[model samples]
Target: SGLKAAQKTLFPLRSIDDVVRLFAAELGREEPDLVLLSLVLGFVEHFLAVNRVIPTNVPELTFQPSPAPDPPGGLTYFPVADLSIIAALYARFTAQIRGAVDLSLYPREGGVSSRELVKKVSDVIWNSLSRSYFKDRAHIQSLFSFITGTKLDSSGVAFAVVGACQALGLRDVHLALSEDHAWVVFGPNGEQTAEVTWHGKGNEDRRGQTVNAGVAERSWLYLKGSYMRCDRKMEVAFMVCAINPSIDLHTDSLELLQLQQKLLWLLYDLGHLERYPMALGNLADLEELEPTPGRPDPLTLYHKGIASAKTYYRDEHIYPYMYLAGYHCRNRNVREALQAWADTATVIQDYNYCREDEEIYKEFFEVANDVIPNLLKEAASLLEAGSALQDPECFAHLLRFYDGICKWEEGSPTPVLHVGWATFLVQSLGRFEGQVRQKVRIVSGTVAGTARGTAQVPAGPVLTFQSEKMKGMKELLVATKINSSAIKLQLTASDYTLSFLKRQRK
Candidate 1:
């Protein structure tokens, strides 16, 4: 009845303002109705598909896109999702969960473990879904899909489990998120956890199991105990972040994108986004695509993402750094890009390489083999590349990047570096002259051993470069031409480095 009353106030969402108001009002509750919010957003995305509205086919353009030249007009209209249908669907979802699960099995007075309760709810959703379908398809990540079709994507299942628990009046149950996965955390102190969803294909779903195994193994998938614990508003933030606008491979719904951007801004203002790093990154991505008039720039948003990850999650997340690095690289901020890549290396160094961590492996792989090589080509092609080439700090950053990867490879079952990586490393190293390389002293111990020793730091290779104030070092600009002309030399000479790494590993 309370939910019905809440829905009555937010019925017939004719404009984006109505939608925003609904979310803003919902998030004000101690336990925001995940089902209501998910169904509403889901309805908007599926409104076109359900009613046979063809999405606007945006032409694929290769040119660097400039922001919209004119301010957006106010006459824009969005699809009005039927609130009566939404209410009925919400009832159906409740009825299904109530009908399927026997609540008496786990009594409140009896010693029912949080894991047992979460696992039971998880089973209700997991076992009831369609058996054989593409689980990664779009527009299936909402309660509408769960109730209407009994189908859900991976994150959808996790969201469903939490939403179902919330519907059952389990206030302790909340969503726990790693970079690539989501689970549930419940119990008095919210200390108990259970896997409520599946991850990558072929890996057996860890439903009803704790993440202790992976966390102890230091897999990046688990974030080594630094995963985000979503409160109700944070869960709402996830729902907004999960809003997908893609109509097909290349085309996207303009309405969905606008709605998502606006909702994210609303969440940002509510401070729900303060601790969620990836959501901040997602917001930054949206802001980059379509600039909001008074919002923070993409770089500032990305910085906040990094700050959130560092302050809250122990800087374990790699994407915030990757997002910043990619932004800097795209804007041709060479030095800042180098520093960003180095920061990315620092984050990856925390976890050992594993087969389950393939997504991150590919991310690092592209950065090493593709992104850096391409960056080198562009940098070398510039007439003013000498300043970047000669900077010792830049060289230090490059070394830290490789060293972090080297550290990641150590004590791991799978090898991270290969022939292509070796080839690129050799060529990239040659870009720096001997004097610049010499200026960067590879310190073998912690920073505490040096004059700048402030606190306890990790014992690994750290870079220390002589400042102008510390030593009378002459600045020398060495112009080294590279790319097409120099790639041939690098190819023939890379074997030495490749064999050396293999031997060192053995």
Candidate 2:
């Protein structure tokens, strides 16, 4: 019981009678099967290659030695590149089986059905993949291409399931698309959209419950006494909607139902971010979410902003976090906004990132909206409402030193000029106001004589400051003197200049 085929023959084939023996050869088959087989073989070969079933004859050409394991805990004869390549193929292979069969299994002649449902799965997975690997979306595209096929996609998994159930006759079992139906599809073209993605989190009260993307398919449905109901227009209590193929739900029987694809779709099509209910065109009047009618709610947008920030490649100059902080401000969470705002600058400098597109006239929108204005108004109101303030400083460097003879303007309305006697130190001229304490001093001095070249040193406040305030004056007075040797010099506390002792501060 052995069979082998030489990697699809070429060069004047097996020359068997084409009329009869050419059965294996009629130019083969979407060639999705051929496509499917190539993927399968490449994968099998890689698996074997990891463990030494590769590169015939030449030992050195083979990877006899093992490579590192990815995600650990599993076998690891091949490095991750080959390993992931093979694994991704298997995943896509599984998805396409359901997608193919379901394409024809359910729905209407001209409306939503298995086909549209397939696309829903496509959108969720596609969007999730793009975001998860945002920096390398293109690389992800290429990787999936390698895994699936050049033309097929993740959505093709639905049809593949369709094909599987049909070819396998679905064991004569049929189920509802409603259970797996995570959305209400309405699309025509560029105007296409859907809503209420299936988070499949085991608690959604999903309309498509047991018949939809749940795990059981037929086994558990039968076990739980939940038979498919296609007798009437099926819908939910709050969300009354339908799939395109009315037949899939409206007049259902085991004829168009198979639960396998739905179960499998559940496995693959997980909506992103979270089980966020703010999907487009949401029907229910969800509370606390406080939706803004047409645009994204602030917090949902906040999460999106944060997501964009984390996934950015920063290959170009980009301040992705600006969206985050900016959204925070718009959400009226100015407190959080500050951190997100400052983070933008930090990441920019640290990563040396910056971005600008060519000839971009303008592509920015101010998102702070009223979140910031309300915040500002609240702040302004607080400020305008009886807030008091005191100055932050004690005093300044206001020290002034002045040395000069003062002439006084007195009662006669005529000014009197004084000679050689009185002087005021600038520091002593300060006036007191309220209770703020103040004082300065010039307490000592030495006066030299000029009349006979003798020493006539003055003591006391030989200098004083003259101001309207009393005791604020520092005065220097010279008493007439000769060489009386006060020690032989007359100590009138005065001096005749033999030399200069112009100014002094004691």
Candidate 3:
């Protein structure tokens, strides 16, 4: 039913004759003149639509700055140049719609064939509208080139010519032409080939052909050309599969998994761990597909890993997990989440490195094997090498983790990790300071210290320090005028201590 509805809506019922009549009536012109104008317009419109220059439905397009004035002749002798200009104009209009529609709908069952649809639309425009413009071949070619921005080279012109023929309902004809190189394509389902030809005695002729199944099947038709260049034979073969509706469930499932993996990794890179849960949930749905033995149950293991990671973030006692949770949450800022995750990862590493128990050691080993290596590599690469991470999406899960932690730790020492976890924050900030500056503003502050008297607060550094040391400090107040360019130094009464700290901006 859906397929039938789509077909009915997509295909138009009006005949070419009917279109010509309508054009004549609209322009208040003679029948022949109107027919030519209609052909030109139809050709231009069809070319644009087939090349995905515009949507098939022209009425929906809002023409920017109305069409240019019609040329001197009022629709009599159709000029090829004018046809080309109209074609170019139509192309510019449709480019924007390419990404908006669901491409999957293009090949639906019972829908108009892509080839036939393109031909019909192009034919209507050429025969009905374009023929009314300019008459001379040179003038038409010039205008067409001016509008389209290039002389219709052999391949392009050939495609246009063939397309026009298809629209006119002419079948069983082959068009062959070459610009820098020669190419040949037979009727609707014929073979297409390309090559370089040399007629002179001294030069060696070079020839190449397409490996398409349809073309290969009809190699006999191409034998004449092949013999002419047999001394320098260089053929390239390709197998072109015909469009079919049958679906391969196994291949489709594998494709789905691959897509999910790619998306998950993308989200992971973006620091959107909270969104990962939903993604994982989708994976769970896929896991329910009929199972076979000895297949490793990849989906199950994947779901388990995700759940374990999620659980670590959800619990209060699992401080390391909380850091990871915060790091992956989508709503939580990426830099903040990365630092949290890094800090937690460091703490977990240290804990495992210190533990003597075999079970704890093994668990830690698995984590080190699976998580720390990749995490450290990524963080170090981004920081030291100054490389932009490929997927910023992973940041989403980190934001989600942060939100959950905030709710869980509503009023506790949990927030203290923000500062104690300074190393992670520092590294993350190093990697993403430019991005942070673009998205957020930092306010400076001062902290009253009994030993050092008073310290001018740094923006990001101070916020990070306070997040970590709020548990230990008695008084912390934010200040107003510290710039990001200024460096901070640590001082002590017992001995002179100086440390330079400043944010990096790129």
Best by TM-score: 1
Over the stretch 1-506, how does candidate 2's per-residue lDDT look in tens digits? 00113322321111112111122231231111222233333332223322334446643232323333345544333212233343355456445444444444454434323435544444433333322212321111122333433332222222222223322233221112221232322223212222222332333343222333222321111211222221111111111111111122343211001111121122113322122111111211121123324544444544543443344322111233444554555455544554453343233222110111111101111212233334445544555574101110110111111111011121212222222111111111111111222222334334554334665444411223332211132221111221112211111125734234544421
Better of 1 and 3 by TM-score: 1
* Alpha-carbon local distance difference test for all models: 0.77, 0.27, 0.30
* Candidates' RMSD to native: 8.7, 34.7, 26.7
Alpha-carbon shift of residue 446 in model 2 (angstroms): 71
Query: Model 1: per-residue lDDT, tens digit, 219-336?
Result: 8989989999999999999988888888878877766777889998988998889999999999899899889898889999999999999999988999999999999989888889
Off by over 4 Å in 1: 48-77, 109-113, 131-136, 384-386, 445-506
Worst lDDT run of 10 residues, candidate 1, spans 469-478
In model 1, the Cα lDDT at residue 230 comes to: 91
TM-score ranking from best candidate downward: 1, 2, 3
Q: What is candidate 2's TM-score against the reference? A: 0.20
TM-score for candidate 3: 0.19
Which residue window of length 10 is worst by lDDT in model 2? 388-397
TM-score of 1: 0.83
Backbone collisions counted per model: 0, 60, 74
Which residues of candidate 2, in runs, are more than 4 Å off? 1-96, 99-102, 105-186, 190-202, 206-506
Minimum summed lDDT over a 10-residue window in model 3 is located at 231-240
- For candidate 1, the clash count comes to 0
